[PDB]
Subunit: 258 residues, 3 copies
């Protein structure tokens, strides 16, 4: 049978068609599991979690457990997971806090390798890869097509925007703008994800515009606002892809990694 | 029922009033669990462990398992945990070795975030916070009100004294004195926990004394013993809080982080 | 009984004499477990795994699970584990990929401390120690008598040769030759494992030869091939132990750590 008899499923849970749940899983209250999702053995879904379609969750993952924030006082909060994600062994995904929006959210087509931690109130987009032992702290926002190298940590409230790459064993304390390669402890920007955007099939002119934008942001001594003005003036009109960089700088709360 | 029927509890275990134990927990021999403690599902308490009152232990924690020291030869040794601790998913807490005192000990009101490791023979005090993926190696002594940032490691035999703060992703190879902020890989002292002690409600004169003590220890070129003499002479009489710094330097075995 | 009634064992598994399997273990298809091996509670052996004799595997280890490589397309691949290994809590050992040789292999007498990850297609020899939270990425080859310090990461395709030592919290991006001490993030060579080879009972003349070889490789400005020529000419004839260093340099694919 698709659901092993030793799984324990709260009466308030709702399980869609063709869901697989292996031995010794625990499904808590107010959990919904979408069609085609597979849980291996030994998965705990704590409660208050909506899981989409065609996910796969491996043994010893702790999914939708209460957060670690000492401010938390038992309020009703949630975790949402989209579709087609891979959540490997030993991951921990925590529910939100009322101080933010009571919601931790992950999108679709993500790979969370062994021991990925997604803290309370994170918002993660689509097509991301978190390598082993990645720790994403509270209220972090991750875009799409991001790669986070193994054993890296992302500090609370940071924003890691689309197509960026974080090198292995990095400590990220500030925002990483769209397309940026950042690495280290301490953690510096090193350039644009040129190979990544070439592999995505982007033109030389587009790439050159983003390289000029990078120089304006990181090498020229300009403030974020000043760099935005230059990108808007000279680069954005022929390189619409530069808008993601502008968005990074406009949306930043912690400042950016340099 | 407060104890799930699928828990397996050794006949020599002793369980106090109002203890909760979730599905698929294993409670080994010579375990005592104090009143009000809650184990979620999938907790293993290996054996020879005394747990106090009002603790909470989450799924996939390995509590009171035999240590990893290759010198260990099956001797009877113990783990003790005090009261009101939070032990999150994937933690590992190991029993002691006869070469020391056959005891790993943690106090009360601690938060051990996901994947905290407490090795054999550690002694940990009260009100500490270990962020995700912290590794505390053998025979480490941690005081009270310490914060250890995520993905940090503390080398065997080190002493991390009260009110200190270890930055994220640090490698601590020597002692961290009371009140000291230390971070990095390699891991340096950077100052006194001023904000921490201000938030604890300490006076400016007290703070200034500790800053002078810091300068004597770290900036003056004096040895630990020489710095102690200066702190005793000039600072300790009006700043009794400086005694914790003196204790750090007097008790050090590995020397101190600089 | 040696096998707990709550273990779930695939009909195609083969279990040798005196095997112990604790509560709530899952043994998947095409698993073989050799004589004297002990699994604690809560071990998952995913499938397609051969385990030798006298191993010990602790709770929440994920052993012989499908790999994390996005290229993997459901092909039949394997994990092999030799004899007398210690696999601690929260380890993850993954099966191979057809792009290599469809096999992850670990030898004998290894200690894998808590949360050791061995990725697809790794080949690990004998008598190695992986400290807590070590991540070994895909296709890595580890020799014998290696020590990997806690919270270190080894990049895909690297080769870590016999008697080498990796310091705690290192990021290894290139090969570490035989006898070499390497540490850091970024990760440099710092010398020969002198104490290690003294403790193995090696002569002063042997040690001096290896130190000269180290200088040729790391300090002289010579290429790997040029250093090999010098070691062959002047050192190898009286110091046969230098052959392991030559092998490291000849076998390197990623180049070596400096």
């Amino acid at each position: 049978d698709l659901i092993h008899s030793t799984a324990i499923i709260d009466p308030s849970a709702v399980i869609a068609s063709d869901v697989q749940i292996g031995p010794y899983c625990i499904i808590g209250p107010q959990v919904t599991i979408g069609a085609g999702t597979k849980l291996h053995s030994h998965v705990v879904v704590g409660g208050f979690t909506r899981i989409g379609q065609n996910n796969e969750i491996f043994q010893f993952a702790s999914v939708g457990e209460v957060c670690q924030d000492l401010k938390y006082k038992g309020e009703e909060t949630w975790l949402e997971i989209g579709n087609n994600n891979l959540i490997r062994e030993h991951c921990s995904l925590h529910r939100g806090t009322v101080q933010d929006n009571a919601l931790t959210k992950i999108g679709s087509h993500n790979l969370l390798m062994v021991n990925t931690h997604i803290a309370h109130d994170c918002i993660v987009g689509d097509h991301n890869i978190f390598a082993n032992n990645v720790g994403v702290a509270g209220h972090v926002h991750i875009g799409d097509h991001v790669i986070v190298g193994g054993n890296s940590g992302i500090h609370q409230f940071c924003k890691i925007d689309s197509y960026s790459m974080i090198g292995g064993a990095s400590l990220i304390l500030k925002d990483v703008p769209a397309y940026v390669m950042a690495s280290g402890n301490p953690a510096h920007a090193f350039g644009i994800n040129i190979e990544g955007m070439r592999r995505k099939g982007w033109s030389k002119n587009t790439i050159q515009g983003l390289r000029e934008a990078y120089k304006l942001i990181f090498k020229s001594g300009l403030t974020s606002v000043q760099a935005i003005d230059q990108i808007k003036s000279e680069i954005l009109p022929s390189v619409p892809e530069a808008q993601l960089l502008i968005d990074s700088l406009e949306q930043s709360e912690r400042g950016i990694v340099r």
